[model samples]
Target: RSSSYSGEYGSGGGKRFSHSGNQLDGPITALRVRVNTYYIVGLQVRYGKVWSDYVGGRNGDLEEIFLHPGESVIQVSGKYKWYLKKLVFVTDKGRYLSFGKDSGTSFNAVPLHPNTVLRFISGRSGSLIDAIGLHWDV
Candidate 1:
Protein backbone atom coordinates (compact mmCIF):
# COMPACT_ATOMS: atom_id res chain seq x y z
CA ARG A 1 0.00 0.00 0.00
CA SER A 2 1.52 3.31 -1.13
CA SER A 3 0.12 6.80 -0.74
CA SER A 4 1.96 9.68 -2.38
CA TYR A 5 1.61 13.30 -1.15
CA SER A 6 1.83 17.04 -1.48
CA GLY A 7 2.72 20.83 -2.96
CA GLU A 8 3.11 19.34 -1.62
CA TYR A 9 5.03 16.27 -0.77
CA GLY A 10 4.78 14.15 2.35
CA SER A 11 6.28 16.44 4.91
CA GLY A 12 9.42 14.76 6.24
CA GLY A 13 8.94 15.72 9.84
CA GLY A 14 7.45 12.75 11.66
CA LYS A 15 6.59 9.51 9.96
CA ARG A 16 7.40 5.83 9.45
CA PHE A 17 7.55 3.46 6.44
CA SER A 18 8.08 -0.24 5.82
CA HIS A 19 9.17 -0.77 2.21
CA SER A 20 9.57 -4.53 2.00
CA GLY A 21 8.44 -4.88 -1.59
CA ASN A 22 9.37 -2.83 -4.59
CA GLN A 23 7.17 0.08 -5.64
CA LEU A 24 8.81 1.02 -8.94
CA ASP A 25 11.32 3.17 -7.06
CA GLY A 26 8.75 5.88 -6.59
CA PRO A 27 8.28 8.42 -3.83
CA ILE A 28 8.51 6.13 -0.79
CA THR A 29 7.74 8.51 2.08
CA ALA A 30 7.72 11.91 3.83
CA LEU A 31 6.14 14.03 6.58
CA ARG A 32 4.00 17.18 7.04
CA VAL A 33 4.57 20.75 8.23
CA ARG A 34 5.29 20.30 11.88
CA VAL A 35 5.93 22.37 14.99
CA ASN A 36 9.34 20.85 15.69
CA THR A 37 12.48 19.61 13.97
CA TYR A 38 12.38 16.28 12.09
CA TYR A 39 14.14 13.06 12.94
CA ILE A 40 14.44 9.81 10.95
CA VAL A 41 14.34 6.32 12.38
CA GLY A 42 14.58 2.78 11.07
CA LEU A 43 12.57 -0.22 12.10
CA GLN A 44 14.13 -2.67 9.66
CA VAL A 45 16.73 -2.01 7.02
CA ARG A 46 17.16 -4.97 4.69
CA TYR A 47 20.64 -5.33 3.26
CA GLY A 48 21.04 -1.58 3.66
CA LYS A 49 21.80 1.08 6.22
CA VAL A 50 20.29 4.48 6.95
CA TRP A 51 22.06 7.83 6.83
CA SER A 52 25.59 7.92 8.29
CA ASP A 53 25.53 4.16 8.52
CA TYR A 54 25.98 3.47 4.80
CA VAL A 55 29.55 3.14 3.62
CA GLY A 56 30.36 4.09 0.06
CA GLY A 57 31.21 7.01 -2.17
CA ARG A 58 28.53 9.73 -2.15
CA ASN A 59 27.89 12.42 -4.76
CA GLY A 60 26.42 14.97 -2.40
CA ASP A 61 27.11 16.05 1.18
CA LEU A 62 26.18 13.47 3.84
CA GLU A 63 27.07 9.77 3.82
CA GLU A 64 23.91 7.66 3.69
CA ILE A 65 23.74 4.07 4.85
CA PHE A 66 23.99 1.37 2.22
CA LEU A 67 21.68 -1.64 2.10
CA HIS A 68 21.75 -4.87 0.15
CA PRO A 69 18.70 -6.63 -1.28
CA GLY A 70 17.33 -8.72 1.59
CA GLU A 71 19.51 -7.76 4.53
CA SER A 72 17.92 -6.16 7.58
CA VAL A 73 18.78 -3.72 10.38
CA ILE A 74 16.38 -1.98 12.73
CA GLN A 75 17.04 1.67 13.56
CA VAL A 76 17.26 2.68 17.22
CA SER A 77 14.05 4.51 17.96
CA GLY A 78 14.94 8.09 18.85
CA LYS A 79 14.75 11.75 17.73
CA TYR A 80 18.26 13.19 17.88
CA LYS A 81 19.12 13.75 14.20
CA TRP A 82 21.06 15.15 11.29
CA TYR A 83 19.56 16.14 7.94
CA LEU A 84 20.07 18.03 4.72
CA LYS A 85 18.04 21.04 3.58
CA LYS A 86 15.81 18.50 1.90
CA LEU A 87 16.38 14.84 1.06
CA VAL A 88 15.50 12.90 -2.07
CA PHE A 89 16.40 9.61 -3.72
CA VAL A 90 17.60 8.92 -7.24
CA THR A 91 18.69 6.01 -9.43
CA ASP A 92 16.65 3.04 -10.65
CA LYS A 93 17.72 0.50 -8.06
CA GLY A 94 17.95 0.55 -4.31
CA ARG A 95 15.93 3.23 -2.54
CA TYR A 96 14.78 5.87 -4.98
CA LEU A 97 13.42 9.25 -3.85
CA SER A 98 10.86 11.96 -4.64
CA PHE A 99 9.82 15.40 -3.52
CA GLY A 100 6.43 15.21 -5.17
CA LYS A 101 4.71 16.03 -8.49
CA ASP A 102 4.01 19.49 -7.17
CA SER A 103 7.66 20.05 -6.19
CA GLY A 104 8.56 19.64 -9.88
CA THR A 105 11.22 17.07 -9.03
CA SER A 106 11.85 13.57 -10.37
CA PHE A 107 12.13 10.50 -8.14
CA ASN A 108 14.95 9.05 -10.17
CA ALA A 109 17.90 11.17 -9.19
CA VAL A 110 21.61 10.55 -9.85
CA PRO A 111 23.23 11.23 -6.50
CA LEU A 112 21.81 11.05 -2.98
CA HIS A 113 21.60 14.61 -1.93
CA PRO A 114 19.40 16.29 0.64
CA ASN A 115 16.65 13.63 0.64
CA THR A 116 18.23 11.48 -2.05
CA VAL A 117 18.36 7.90 -0.68
CA LEU A 118 18.91 5.77 -3.79
CA ARG A 119 21.42 2.99 -3.69
CA PHE A 120 23.95 2.42 -6.50
CA ILE A 121 24.48 -1.25 -5.63
CA SER A 122 28.01 -0.56 -4.45
CA GLY A 123 28.20 -3.91 -2.67
CA ARG A 124 28.00 -2.18 0.67
CA SER A 125 27.31 -4.18 3.84
CA GLY A 126 23.75 -3.36 4.93
CA SER A 127 20.05 -3.98 4.31
CA LEU A 128 17.42 -2.93 1.76
CA ILE A 129 15.31 -1.25 4.37
CA ASP A 130 12.53 -3.80 4.56
CA ALA A 131 10.91 -1.94 7.46
CA ILE A 132 11.79 1.66 8.24
CA GLY A 133 10.12 4.45 10.24
CA LEU A 134 10.48 8.11 11.23
CA HIS A 135 9.60 10.24 14.31
CA TRP A 136 9.25 14.00 14.84
CA ASP A 137 6.64 16.76 15.20
CA VAL A 138 6.52 15.92 18.90
Candidate 2:
Protein backbone atom coordinates (compact mmCIF):
# COMPACT_ATOMS: atom_id res chain seq x y z
CA ARG A 1 0.00 0.00 0.00
CA SER A 2 1.06 3.59 -0.52
CA SER A 3 2.21 5.12 2.76
CA SER A 4 0.78 8.04 4.74
CA TYR A 5 3.03 10.88 5.93
CA SER A 6 3.15 12.48 9.36
CA GLY A 7 4.95 15.82 8.97
CA GLU A 8 7.57 18.07 7.45
CA TYR A 9 8.47 19.40 10.85
CA GLY A 10 10.87 22.37 11.24
CA SER A 11 11.87 25.14 8.87
CA GLY A 12 11.44 25.01 5.12
CA GLY A 13 15.13 25.33 4.28
CA GLY A 14 17.75 23.15 2.58
CA LYS A 15 17.40 20.58 -0.22
CA ARG A 16 14.65 17.98 0.03
CA PHE A 17 15.29 14.25 0.42
CA SER A 18 12.64 11.56 0.10
CA HIS A 19 12.62 7.79 0.71
CA SER A 20 8.92 7.29 0.60
CA GLY A 21 6.71 4.65 -1.18
CA ASN A 22 9.57 2.46 -2.37
CA GLN A 23 8.42 -0.88 -1.01
CA LEU A 24 10.84 -2.98 -3.07
CA ASP A 25 13.68 -1.55 -1.00
CA GLY A 26 11.98 -3.25 1.97
CA PRO A 27 11.12 -2.08 5.45
CA ILE A 28 13.55 0.19 7.26
CA THR A 29 16.04 -2.02 9.07
CA ALA A 30 18.68 0.40 10.25
CA LEU A 31 19.69 4.04 10.45
CA ARG A 32 22.80 6.17 10.72
CA VAL A 33 22.98 9.73 11.96
CA ARG A 34 25.84 12.18 12.09
CA VAL A 35 25.35 14.61 14.91
CA ASN A 36 27.26 17.46 16.52
CA THR A 37 26.82 19.69 19.52
CA TYR A 38 24.22 21.91 17.90
CA TYR A 39 22.55 19.99 15.06
CA ILE A 40 21.80 16.75 13.37
CA VAL A 41 24.44 16.71 10.67
CA GLY A 42 23.41 13.85 8.37
CA LEU A 43 21.30 10.69 7.99
CA GLN A 44 21.17 7.31 6.26
CA VAL A 45 18.64 4.50 6.29
CA ARG A 46 18.90 0.81 5.48
CA TYR A 47 15.95 -0.54 3.54
CA GLY A 48 15.98 -4.31 3.23
CA LYS A 49 19.71 -4.77 2.67
CA VAL A 50 20.25 -1.57 0.71
CA TRP A 51 21.38 1.66 2.30
CA SER A 52 19.94 4.86 0.92
CA ASP A 53 22.20 7.63 -0.33
CA TYR A 54 23.64 9.70 2.48
CA VAL A 55 22.10 13.17 2.94
CA GLY A 56 23.16 16.36 4.76
CA GLY A 57 26.68 17.62 5.55
CA ARG A 58 29.44 15.84 7.41
CA ASN A 59 30.53 17.67 10.52
CA GLY A 60 29.76 15.45 13.49
CA ASP A 61 30.16 12.01 15.03
CA LEU A 62 28.28 9.21 13.29
CA GLU A 63 26.00 6.89 15.20
CA GLU A 64 24.32 3.82 13.74
CA ILE A 65 21.68 1.37 15.00
CA PHE A 66 20.01 -1.76 13.68
CA LEU A 67 16.44 -2.80 14.36
CA HIS A 68 15.67 -6.21 15.75
CA PRO A 69 14.30 -8.73 13.29
CA GLY A 70 10.57 -8.21 12.71
CA GLU A 71 10.91 -4.81 14.31
CA SER A 72 9.80 -1.49 12.89
CA VAL A 73 9.80 2.14 13.88
CA ILE A 74 6.46 3.23 15.29
CA GLN A 75 7.09 6.83 16.26
CA VAL A 76 9.59 9.60 15.63
CA SER A 77 10.06 12.58 17.93
CA GLY A 78 12.65 15.33 17.82
CA LYS A 79 13.79 18.85 18.47
CA TYR A 80 14.14 21.56 15.87
CA LYS A 81 14.07 25.31 16.00
CA TRP A 82 15.54 26.54 12.76
CA TYR A 83 17.60 23.37 12.18
CA LEU A 84 17.02 19.87 13.58
CA LYS A 85 18.70 19.37 16.90
CA LYS A 86 17.74 15.87 18.08
CA LEU A 87 15.74 12.74 17.16
CA VAL A 88 14.19 9.83 18.96
CA PHE A 89 13.15 6.77 16.99
CA VAL A 90 10.72 4.66 18.99
CA THR A 91 10.57 1.11 17.74
CA ASP A 92 7.87 -1.53 17.94
CA LYS A 93 10.35 -3.36 20.10
CA GLY A 94 9.88 -0.59 22.65
CA ARG A 95 13.37 0.84 22.25
CA TYR A 96 14.05 4.51 21.95
CA LEU A 97 17.05 5.04 19.70
CA SER A 98 18.05 8.64 20.19
CA PHE A 99 20.54 10.93 18.44
CA GLY A 100 21.97 14.40 18.69
CA LYS A 101 21.67 16.75 21.67
CA ASP A 102 18.43 17.65 23.46
CA SER A 103 17.57 21.30 22.70
CA GLY A 104 15.38 23.43 20.45
CA THR A 105 11.59 23.33 19.93
CA SER A 106 10.09 19.83 20.10
CA PHE A 107 8.07 17.71 17.72
CA ASN A 108 6.58 14.22 17.96
CA ALA A 109 5.49 12.40 14.82
CA VAL A 110 3.04 9.53 14.79
CA PRO A 111 1.07 7.80 12.11
CA LEU A 112 -1.97 9.68 10.91
CA HIS A 113 -3.84 6.39 10.57
CA PRO A 114 -4.21 3.70 13.18
CA ASN A 115 -2.46 0.32 12.94
CA THR A 116 0.19 1.79 10.64
CA VAL A 117 3.90 1.84 11.29
CA LEU A 118 6.75 4.02 10.08
CA ARG A 119 7.98 2.72 6.75
CA PHE A 120 10.24 5.48 5.46
CA ILE A 121 11.26 9.11 5.86
CA SER A 122 11.71 12.31 3.87
CA GLY A 123 13.28 15.59 4.84
CA ARG A 124 15.29 18.69 4.07
CA SER A 125 18.95 18.98 4.85
CA GLY A 126 22.02 21.05 4.23
CA SER A 127 24.99 20.99 6.64
CA LEU A 128 22.36 20.04 9.19
CA ILE A 129 18.92 18.48 8.90
CA ASP A 130 16.43 21.30 8.44
CA ALA A 131 13.18 19.35 8.55
CA ILE A 132 11.75 15.81 8.68
CA GLY A 133 8.78 13.71 7.54
CA LEU A 134 7.65 10.24 8.57
CA HIS A 135 5.92 7.85 6.19
CA TRP A 136 3.77 5.08 7.57
CA ASP A 137 1.90 2.01 6.36
CA VAL A 138 0.45 -1.25 7.61
Candidate 3:
Protein backbone atom coordinates (compact mmCIF):
# COMPACT_ATOMS: atom_id res chain seq x y z
CA ARG A 1 0.00 0.00 0.00
CA SER A 2 1.30 3.44 -0.94
CA SER A 3 -0.01 6.84 0.22
CA SER A 4 0.32 10.03 -1.82
CA TYR A 5 1.03 13.28 0.03
CA SER A 6 0.65 16.71 -1.53
CA GLY A 7 1.43 19.75 0.52
CA GLU A 8 3.42 22.98 0.20
CA TYR A 9 5.21 24.85 2.97
CA GLY A 10 6.68 28.31 2.74
CA SER A 11 7.64 31.34 4.87
CA GLY A 12 6.56 34.96 4.59
CA GLY A 13 3.01 33.99 3.61
CA GLY A 14 0.06 35.96 5.00
CA LYS A 15 2.30 38.95 5.31
CA ARG A 16 0.78 42.37 4.74
CA PHE A 17 2.26 44.69 2.15
CA SER A 18 2.69 47.40 4.77
CA HIS A 19 -0.14 49.62 3.71
CA SER A 20 1.11 53.04 4.75
CA GLY A 21 -1.52 54.87 6.74
CA ASN A 22 -1.91 58.05 8.73
CA GLN A 23 -0.19 57.45 12.06
CA LEU A 24 0.82 60.85 13.47
CA ASP A 25 2.41 60.87 16.93
CA GLY A 26 4.96 62.95 18.81
CA PRO A 27 5.54 65.81 21.32
CA ILE A 28 4.19 69.39 21.45
CA THR A 29 6.39 72.42 21.21
CA ALA A 30 5.84 76.16 21.61
CA LEU A 31 4.43 77.58 18.39
CA ARG A 32 5.19 81.16 17.56
CA VAL A 33 2.27 83.45 16.97
CA ARG A 34 2.81 85.67 13.97
CA VAL A 35 -0.14 87.95 14.45
CA ASN A 36 -0.93 89.12 17.92
CA THR A 37 -4.55 89.98 17.31
CA TYR A 38 -7.27 89.64 14.72
CA TYR A 39 -5.95 86.30 13.52
CA ILE A 40 -6.67 82.62 13.80
CA VAL A 41 -5.09 80.34 16.36
CA GLY A 42 -5.39 76.84 15.12
CA LEU A 43 -3.43 73.70 14.25
CA GLN A 44 -1.68 72.66 11.03
CA VAL A 45 -0.56 69.30 9.69
CA ARG A 46 1.50 67.87 6.83
CA TYR A 47 0.79 64.50 5.32
CA GLY A 48 2.89 62.84 2.65
CA LYS A 49 5.27 65.80 2.74
CA VAL A 50 2.41 68.18 2.07
CA TRP A 51 1.53 70.90 4.57
CA SER A 52 -2.10 71.55 5.31
CA ASP A 53 -3.25 75.06 6.18
CA TYR A 54 -5.11 76.33 9.25
CA VAL A 55 -7.28 73.48 10.38
CA GLY A 56 -9.53 75.26 12.86
CA GLY A 57 -10.26 78.92 12.44
CA ARG A 58 -12.26 81.46 14.38
CA ASN A 59 -12.50 85.23 14.61
CA GLY A 60 -9.64 86.16 16.98
CA ASP A 61 -11.58 86.38 20.18
CA LEU A 62 -11.65 84.94 23.66
CA GLU A 63 -14.41 82.49 22.98
CA GLU A 64 -13.15 81.85 19.46
CA ILE A 65 -9.72 80.75 20.58
CA PHE A 66 -11.25 78.93 23.55
CA LEU A 67 -8.35 79.99 25.65
CA HIS A 68 -8.49 80.79 29.31
CA PRO A 69 -6.36 82.85 31.65
CA GLY A 70 -2.99 81.36 32.53
CA GLU A 71 -3.64 78.76 29.86
CA SER A 72 -0.50 78.70 27.80
CA VAL A 73 -0.80 77.58 24.20
CA ILE A 74 0.90 74.25 23.57
CA GLN A 75 1.25 72.03 20.51
CA VAL A 76 1.48 68.31 19.75
CA SER A 77 3.87 67.42 16.96
CA GLY A 78 3.71 64.20 14.94
CA LYS A 79 3.95 62.63 11.49
CA TYR A 80 1.41 60.89 9.29
CA LYS A 81 1.40 59.18 5.92
CA TRP A 82 -0.87 57.43 3.43
CA TYR A 83 -3.88 59.23 4.90
CA LEU A 84 -4.82 61.60 7.70
CA LYS A 85 -7.04 59.69 10.02
CA LYS A 86 -7.46 62.49 12.54
CA LEU A 87 -5.96 65.46 14.40
CA VAL A 88 -5.62 65.96 18.14
CA PHE A 89 -4.64 68.92 20.31
CA VAL A 90 -3.03 68.63 23.75
CA THR A 91 -2.37 71.41 26.19
CA ASP A 92 0.06 71.62 29.06
CA LYS A 93 -2.86 72.08 31.44
CA GLY A 94 -4.03 68.53 30.83
CA ARG A 95 -6.49 69.58 28.18
CA TYR A 96 -7.01 67.61 25.01
CA LEU A 97 -8.72 68.79 21.83
CA SER A 98 -9.39 66.36 19.03
CA PHE A 99 -10.16 67.83 15.64
CA GLY A 100 -11.00 66.14 12.32
CA LYS A 101 -13.25 63.12 12.02
CA ASP A 102 -16.58 64.88 12.11
CA SER A 103 -15.09 68.28 12.71
CA GLY A 104 -16.91 69.75 9.72
CA THR A 105 -13.80 70.06 7.64
CA SER A 106 -12.70 68.39 4.40
CA PHE A 107 -8.99 68.95 5.00
CA ASN A 108 -8.62 65.54 6.58
CA ALA A 109 -9.93 63.95 3.42
CA VAL A 110 -6.50 64.27 1.83
CA PRO A 111 -4.17 61.25 1.61
CA LEU A 112 -0.74 61.25 3.20
CA HIS A 113 1.72 58.57 2.23
CA PRO A 114 5.21 57.66 3.48
CA ASN A 115 8.00 60.18 4.05
CA THR A 116 5.40 62.65 5.25
CA VAL A 117 6.26 65.38 7.73
CA LEU A 118 3.56 66.77 10.03
CA ARG A 119 3.83 70.08 11.83
CA PHE A 120 1.84 71.84 14.55
CA ILE A 121 1.63 75.61 14.47
CA SER A 122 -0.55 78.49 15.68
CA GLY A 123 -2.00 79.88 12.49
CA ARG A 124 -1.99 83.54 13.50
CA SER A 125 -1.12 84.75 10.07
CA GLY A 126 -1.97 82.62 7.08
CA SER A 127 -1.32 78.94 6.32
CA LEU A 128 2.20 79.18 7.70
CA ILE A 129 2.87 77.77 11.15
CA ASP A 130 6.05 78.35 13.17
CA ALA A 131 7.33 74.94 12.16
CA ILE A 132 7.92 74.01 15.78
CA GLY A 133 8.94 70.41 15.04
CA LEU A 134 9.70 68.20 12.06
CA HIS A 135 9.95 64.40 11.67
CA TRP A 136 9.51 61.61 9.15
CA ASP A 137 8.73 57.89 9.22
CA VAL A 138 11.53 55.41 8.59
Candidate 4:
Protein backbone atom coordinates (compact mmCIF):
# COMPACT_ATOMS: atom_id res chain seq x y z
CA ARG A 1 0.00 0.00 0.00
CA SER A 2 1.02 3.60 -0.53
CA SER A 3 0.54 6.89 1.33
CA SER A 4 1.29 10.52 0.59
CA TYR A 5 0.84 14.04 1.99
CA SER A 6 1.12 17.57 0.67
CA GLY A 7 0.30 21.17 1.53
CA GLU A 8 -1.75 23.91 -0.16
CA TYR A 9 -0.50 24.51 -3.72
CA GLY A 10 2.97 23.12 -3.24
CA SER A 11 3.30 24.93 0.06
CA GLY A 12 4.69 21.91 1.84
CA GLY A 13 4.99 20.11 -1.46
CA GLY A 14 4.29 16.40 -1.01
CA LYS A 15 5.91 13.38 0.57
CA ARG A 16 5.08 9.73 -0.09
CA PHE A 17 5.94 6.15 0.83
CA SER A 18 4.67 2.60 0.31
CA HIS A 19 4.37 -0.66 2.21
CA SER A 20 5.82 -3.94 1.00
CA GLY A 21 3.54 -6.87 0.20
CA ASN A 22 5.54 -8.92 2.68
CA GLN A 23 4.26 -6.78 5.54
CA LEU A 24 0.77 -8.32 5.31
CA ASP A 25 0.03 -11.37 7.45
CA GLY A 26 -2.59 -12.74 9.86
CA PRO A 27 -4.05 -15.74 11.72
CA ILE A 28 -6.71 -16.33 9.10
CA THR A 29 -5.91 -18.66 6.24
CA ALA A 30 -6.45 -17.95 2.57
CA LEU A 31 -4.92 -14.56 2.87
CA ARG A 32 -6.74 -12.15 0.60
CA VAL A 33 -3.61 -10.56 -0.77
CA ARG A 34 -5.23 -7.60 -2.41
CA VAL A 35 -2.17 -5.93 -3.77
CA ASN A 36 -2.05 -2.13 -3.72
CA THR A 37 -4.96 -1.36 -1.43
CA TYR A 38 -4.83 0.11 2.06
CA TYR A 39 -5.57 3.21 4.06
CA ILE A 40 -4.17 5.40 6.83
CA VAL A 41 -6.46 4.46 9.70
CA GLY A 42 -5.14 7.16 12.01
CA LEU A 43 -2.12 9.13 13.19
CA GLN A 44 -0.91 10.70 16.41
CA VAL A 45 1.83 13.20 17.21
CA ARG A 46 3.23 14.16 20.57
CA TYR A 47 5.14 17.19 21.78
CA GLY A 48 8.33 18.07 23.71
CA LYS A 49 11.61 16.12 23.67
CA VAL A 50 9.73 13.28 25.33
CA TRP A 51 6.72 13.19 23.00
CA SER A 52 3.99 14.72 25.12
CA ASP A 53 0.29 15.42 24.30
CA TYR A 54 -0.99 15.79 20.76
CA VAL A 55 -0.22 19.31 19.62
CA GLY A 56 0.25 20.59 16.05
CA GLY A 57 -2.97 21.67 14.34
CA ARG A 58 -6.19 21.80 16.30
CA ASN A 59 -7.96 20.19 13.35
CA GLY A 60 -6.89 16.70 14.28
CA ASP A 61 -8.84 13.47 13.77
CA LEU A 62 -7.81 13.13 10.14
CA GLU A 63 -8.68 9.86 8.41
CA GLU A 64 -7.24 8.89 5.03
CA ILE A 65 -8.85 6.17 2.94
CA PHE A 66 -7.79 3.51 0.43
CA LEU A 67 -4.61 4.05 -1.49
CA HIS A 68 -3.80 2.07 -4.60
CA PRO A 69 -0.58 0.11 -4.88
CA GLY A 70 2.22 2.46 -5.82
CA GLU A 71 -0.10 5.36 -4.99
CA SER A 72 0.35 7.70 -2.00
CA VAL A 73 -1.29 10.41 0.11
CA ILE A 74 -0.01 13.12 2.45
CA GLN A 75 -1.50 15.08 5.35
CA VAL A 76 -0.32 17.12 8.31
CA SER A 77 -0.60 14.69 11.18
CA GLY A 78 1.05 17.07 13.62
CA LYS A 79 2.39 20.54 13.58
CA TYR A 80 5.10 21.98 15.83
CA LYS A 81 4.14 19.65 18.62
CA TRP A 82 6.80 18.54 21.06
CA TYR A 83 9.28 20.25 18.81
CA LEU A 84 8.20 18.02 15.92
CA LYS A 85 7.28 19.99 12.87
CA LYS A 86 5.97 17.42 10.45
CA LEU A 87 5.38 13.66 10.39
CA VAL A 88 6.41 11.85 7.25
CA PHE A 89 6.52 8.36 5.76
CA VAL A 90 10.08 7.59 4.82
CA THR A 91 9.92 4.03 3.42
CA ASP A 92 8.58 0.53 3.91
CA LYS A 93 10.08 -2.78 4.95
CA GLY A 94 8.62 -6.26 5.39
CA ARG A 95 7.43 -5.71 8.93
CA TYR A 96 6.66 -2.00 8.66
CA LEU A 97 8.01 1.18 7.19
CA SER A 98 9.91 4.12 8.68
CA PHE A 99 8.03 7.32 9.63
CA GLY A 100 9.44 10.66 10.73
CA LYS A 101 9.10 14.34 10.06
CA ASP A 102 11.18 17.41 9.27
CA SER A 103 11.40 20.39 11.58
CA GLY A 104 8.86 23.11 10.83
CA THR A 105 10.24 25.17 7.98
CA SER A 106 10.49 24.73 4.23
CA PHE A 107 10.03 21.40 2.45
CA ASN A 108 12.86 18.92 1.83
CA ALA A 109 14.68 19.97 4.97
CA VAL A 110 16.06 17.95 7.86
CA PRO A 111 14.10 17.65 11.08
CA LEU A 112 14.67 20.41 13.60
CA HIS A 113 15.00 17.79 16.29
CA PRO A 114 16.25 14.21 16.35
CA ASN A 115 14.05 11.38 15.12
CA THR A 116 12.36 10.18 18.28
CA VAL A 117 11.18 6.83 16.92
CA LEU A 118 11.73 4.19 14.26
CA ARG A 119 7.94 4.43 14.11
CA PHE A 120 6.36 1.28 12.69
CA ILE A 121 3.50 -1.03 13.58
CA SER A 122 2.90 -4.73 13.00
CA GLY A 123 1.33 -5.52 9.67
CA ARG A 124 -0.38 -8.57 11.14
CA SER A 125 -2.41 -6.46 13.54
CA GLY A 126 -1.39 -2.79 13.24
CA SER A 127 -0.02 -2.48 16.75
CA LEU A 128 2.97 -0.51 17.92
CA ILE A 129 5.73 -2.99 17.08
CA ASP A 130 8.73 -0.76 17.68
CA ALA A 131 9.39 2.64 19.15
CA ILE A 132 12.89 3.89 18.34
CA GLY A 133 12.89 6.70 20.84
CA LEU A 134 15.03 9.77 20.19
CA HIS A 135 17.60 8.37 17.78
CA TRP A 136 18.36 11.33 15.54
CA ASP A 137 19.56 14.87 16.25
CA VAL A 138 18.36 17.98 14.48
- Whole-model lDDT values for every prediction: 0.24, 0.89, 0.29, 0.23
TM-score of each: 0.19, 0.94, 0.26, 0.22
Clashing pairs in 3: 28-75, 81-112, 82-112, 82-113
Clash totals for all candidate models: 35, 0, 4, 14
Model 1 Cα lDDT, one tens digit per residue, 78-102 = 1122221233433334343322112
Q: Return the candidate ranking by lDDT, descending.
A: 2, 3, 1, 4
- Candidate 2 residues 4-109, lDDT tens each? 8878887999899898645578988999999998999999999999999899998999999998999999899999988989999999889999998888898888
**Which tens-of-lDDT digit does each residue in 21-71 have in candidate 4?**
212321111111111111122233221112212212322234222223332
Q: Which stretches of candidate 4 lie over 4 Å from their true place?
A: 1-59, 72-85, 88-138
Can you tell me which runs of candidate 1 are displaced by over 4 Å? Answer: 1-22, 26-60, 81-138
Q: Which candidate number would show the highest lDDT if scored against the true structure?
A: 2
TM-score ranking, high to low: 2, 3, 4, 1
Question: What's the residue-level lDDT of 41 in candidate 4?
Answer: 24
Report the C-alpha displacement of residue 123, candidate 1, in angstroms: 29
lDDT of 1: 0.24
User: lDDT tens digits, residues 1-138, model 3?
Assistant: 121111111112221211123224322232212222322234433333343433433433222124333443233322222222233445547665543233222222111343222222221222321112222222
lDDT of 1 at 70: 40
